[PDB]
Amino acid sequence: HILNSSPSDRQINQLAQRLGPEWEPMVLSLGLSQTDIYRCKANHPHNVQSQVVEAFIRWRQRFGKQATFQSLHNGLRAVEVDPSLLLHMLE
């Protein structure tokens, strides 16, 4: 169920807080372009947190029904990041 649902604004903020610099390669693997990522940084010069949130918001808007927790799990694995991060986040 949850694995097939999309993260809420609150959940995207939690993911961004828990995530390190791997957020970049991760969103790249999820389908965002270098330019999308460049714009996220340009839009929030003094707030990395907001950059990461915007990135995942863009990913969620672009892939809609497919921008799910299952996808995030796959992304985390792609960037050699412990996917357990999601479990702790959802508990």
In angstroms, the CA 68 to CA 66 distance is 5
CATH classification at residue 30: 1.10.533.10
Question: Residue 43 sits in which domain range?
Answer: 1-91
Number of compact structural domains in the chain: 1
Give the residue from 12, 91, 19 showing the smallest Cα distance to 59: 12
Residue 89 identity (one-letter amino acid)? M
Method of elucidation: X-ray
In angstroms, the CA 41 to CA 50 distance is 8
In angstroms, the CA 20 to CA 6 distance is 21
Give the residue from 1, 35, 26 showing the smallest Cα distance to 85: 26
Burial of 28-38, coded b for 16+ CB within 10 Å and e otherwise, reads: bebebeeebbe
Cβ contacts of 60 within 8 Å, gap of 6 or more? 6, 7, 12, 67
In contact, 23 and 16? CB cutoff 8 Å: yes
In angstroms, the CA 20 to CA 24 distance is 9
